Design a protein around this motif. Structure first.
Motif, PDB file in Angstrom:
ATOM      1  N   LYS A  62       0.826  -1.212   0.000  1.00  0.00           N
ATOM      2  CA  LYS A  62       0.000   0.000   0.000  1.00  0.00           C
ATOM      3  C   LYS A  62       0.860   1.261   0.000  1.00  0.00           C
ATOM      4  CE  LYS A  62      -2.333  -3.259  -0.040  1.00  0.00           C
ATOM      5  NZ  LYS A  62      -2.876  -3.812  -1.318  1.00  0.00           N
ATOM      6  N   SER A  89      -3.417   8.631   1.944  1.00  0.00           N
ATOM      7  CA  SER A  89      -3.303   7.385   1.211  1.00  0.00           C
ATOM      8  C   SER A  89      -3.341   7.596  -0.294  1.00  0.00           C
ATOM      9  CB  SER A  89      -4.418   6.438   1.632  1.00  0.00           C
ATOM     10  OG  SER A  89      -4.565   5.404   0.675  1.00  0.00           O
ATOM     11  N   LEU A  90      -2.513   6.830  -1.001  1.00  0.00           N
ATOM     12  CA  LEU A  90      -2.491   6.841  -2.460  1.00  0.00           C
ATOM     13  C   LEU A  90      -3.144   5.609  -3.071  1.00  0.00           C
ATOM     14  CD1 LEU A  90       0.972   8.315  -3.296  1.00  0.00           C
ATOM     15  CD2 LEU A  90      -1.238   9.397  -3.497  1.00  0.00           C
ATOM     16  N   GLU A  91      -3.931   4.862  -2.319  1.00  0.00           N
ATOM     17  CA  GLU A  91      -4.652   3.745  -2.905  1.00  0.00           C
ATOM     18  C   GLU A  91      -6.073   4.172  -3.263  1.00  0.00           C
ATOM     19  OE1 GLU A  91      -3.405   0.680  -3.552  1.00  0.00           O
ATOM     20  OE2 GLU A  91      -1.393   1.389  -2.972  1.00  0.00           O
ATOM     21  N   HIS A  92      -6.525   3.819  -4.467  1.00  0.00           N
ATOM     22  CA  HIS A  92      -7.891   4.139  -4.901  1.00  0.00           C
ATOM     23  C   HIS A  92      -8.901   3.364  -4.072  1.00  0.00           C
ATOM     24  CE1 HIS A  92      -4.968   3.841  -8.231  1.00  0.00           C
ATOM     25  NE2 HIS A  92      -5.412   5.033  -8.591  1.00  0.00           N
TER      26      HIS A  92
END
Length: 92
Positions: A62, A89-92
């Motif tokens: 992640k 956060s850089l998670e879609h």
């Protein structure tokens, strides 16, 4: 470029010491009273600061944004992290 301050009881260094005592007294709920300086050294103009926003992936893969504040004193080879915070956060 650490240099010995030859007379350390001028107003400038007494002011610095009194400010340090006030800060300590506030944090430690203490009641110190400054008396006099004994020795003083100073290193002027050698502190560099870097404010870096970066992406990094963790053990699970992640990704996230971190902000780091880094202090560098090149003459002493010193590099220190003063802040390292997770920002988002850089998670879609």
């Amino acid at each position: 470029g650490i240099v010995n301050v030859p007379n350390c009881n001028t107003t400038k260094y007494q002011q610095l010491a009194r400010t340090a005592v006030a800060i300590y007294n506030y944090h430690e709920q203490a009641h110190l009273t400054f008396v006099e300086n004994l020795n003083c050294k100073e290193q002027l103009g050698e502190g560099d600061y870097y404010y870096i926003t970066l992406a990094a992936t963790d053990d699970a893969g992640k990704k996230a944004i971190y902000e780091a504040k880094i202090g560098v004193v090149e003459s002493a080879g010193w590099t220190g992290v003063e802040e390292f915070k997770l920002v988002g956060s850089l998670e879609h």
